[PDB]
Amino acid sequence: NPESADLRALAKHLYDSYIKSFPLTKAKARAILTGKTTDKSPFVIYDMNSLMMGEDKIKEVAIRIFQGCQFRSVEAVQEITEYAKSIPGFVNLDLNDQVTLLKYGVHEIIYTMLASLMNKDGVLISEGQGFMTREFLKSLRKPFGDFMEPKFEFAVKFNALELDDSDLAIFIAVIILSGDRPGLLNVKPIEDIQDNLLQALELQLKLNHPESSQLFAKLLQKMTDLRQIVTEHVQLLQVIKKTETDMSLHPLLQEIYKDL
Ligand SMILES: CC(C)(c1cc(Cl)c(O)c(Cl)c1)c1cc(Cl)c(O)c(Cl)c1
């Protein structure tokens, strides 16, 4: 199995860069989320009072929340970018294509990973020091009431796959190296890499979840739900910028969303 060996090694490599690039792994998240802890347990924000009291420990309000999420996104992009660099082959591509892959692949990954920080009842924030309930979010005045919902929706179905960090590291790699993205100057070197990634992913999922029939197909199919989330988000923003023309947007995100 020297063929296999090569892939395993690649899987191992991606996991490592993953752990090195992302401060809040699904493992830390699930530990805080469940209570393996007298030391990890989060402060919960579930209403306006606790919001005010959460602020005690570490604009408007619905807007203040939204811009916090937006800024975390910016921070998240930085992380993913550092991770991509580590994907064997990626930095060797046409610079323009590197930029194009990041442009499209970054949100998909954000939400995939955002799922690690959620369960049906809500989502970790402030690096896990806090926990905002799904219900508090819905309560936010339209249109912000609607922004975390579709994300929770995905995370619930997605989390059902029970992927761990090591499966995810390969999966976000497969996402970045997507050849079908618009305006790619040079697709084939991309497809060749992703073939390898896909091969690695496949192997990884059956070694690590052998009693889980067709998880690979099941997991590949989730990429439809991701683009939907992304699309709605972008629709949501098109609207916000017209109702709240006093609310800013981070130029980086502005650039990612442009012509998306
Ligand atoms: C709310 C949440 C989960 C988030 C993150 C991203 Cl990246 C995102 O794009 C969206 Cl809409 C929501 C978040 C917010 C903060 Cl302030 C934080 O420190 C952490 Cl660890 C997580």
Author numbering: 205 to 262, 275 to 476
What text comes from the article?
Recently, Somm et al. (2009) showed that perinatal exposure to BPA altered early adipogenesis in the rat, which is mediated by peroxisome proliferator–activated receptor γ (PPARγ), a nuclear hormone receptor whose dysregulation is involved in the onset of diabetes and obesity. We provide the first experimental evidence that flame retardants TBBPA and TCBPA are ligands and partial agonists of human PPARγ and also activate the corresponding zebrafish and Xenopus receptors. PPARγ displays a large LBP that extends from the C-terminal helix H12 to the β-sheet S1/S2 so that halogenated BPA occupies a small portion of the LBP. Full agonists of PPARγ (e.g., rosiglitazone) have been reported to fully activate their cognate receptor by directly interacting with and stabilizing helix H12, whereas compounds that do not directly contact H12 behave as weak or partial agonists by stabilizing other regions of the LBD, including H3 and the β-sheet S1/S2.
The closely related tetrachlorobisphenol A (TCBPA) is also used as a flame retardant, but in much lower quantities than TBBPA (< 10 000 tons/year), and its presence in environmental samples has been unequivocally demonstrated. TCBPA was soaked into a PPARγ apo-crystal by adding 0.5 µL TCBPA at a concentration of 1 mM suspended in well solution directly to the crystal drop. The crystals were soaked for 4 days. We collected diffraction data at the ID14-1 beamline at 2.55 Å and 2.70 Å resolution for TBBPA-PPARγ and TCBPA-PPARγ complexes, respectively, using an ADSC Quantum Q210 CCD detector at the European Synchrotron Radiation facility (ESRF, Grenoble, France). The TBBPA and TCBPA complex structures are indistinguishable, with a root mean square deviation (RMSD) value of 0.29 Å for superimposed alpha carbons and nearly identical to that of PPARγ in complex with the agonist rosiglitazone, with an RMSD value of 0.62 Å. Omission of Fo-Fc difference maps for the TBBPA and TCBPA structures revealed clear density for the ligands that could be positioned unambiguously into the PPARγ ligand-binding pocket (LBP). Whereas rosiglitazone occupies a region of the LBP spanning H11/H12 to the β-sheet S1/S2, TBBPA and TCBPA occupy only the region between H3 and the β-sheet S1/S2, with cycle A nestled between H3 and the β-sheet. In contrast with rosiglitazone, a consequence of the smaller size of halogenated BPAs is that they do not interact directly with H12. The hydroxyl group from cycle A interacts with the main chain nitrogen atom of Ser342 (β-sheet S1/S2), whereas the second one (cycle B) is hydrogen-bonded to Ser289 in H3 and Tyr473 from H12 through a water-mediated hydrogen bond network. The half maximal inhibitory concentration (IC50) values for rosiglitazone, TBBPA, and TCBPA were 12.0 nM, 0.7 μM, and 6.0 μM, respectively.
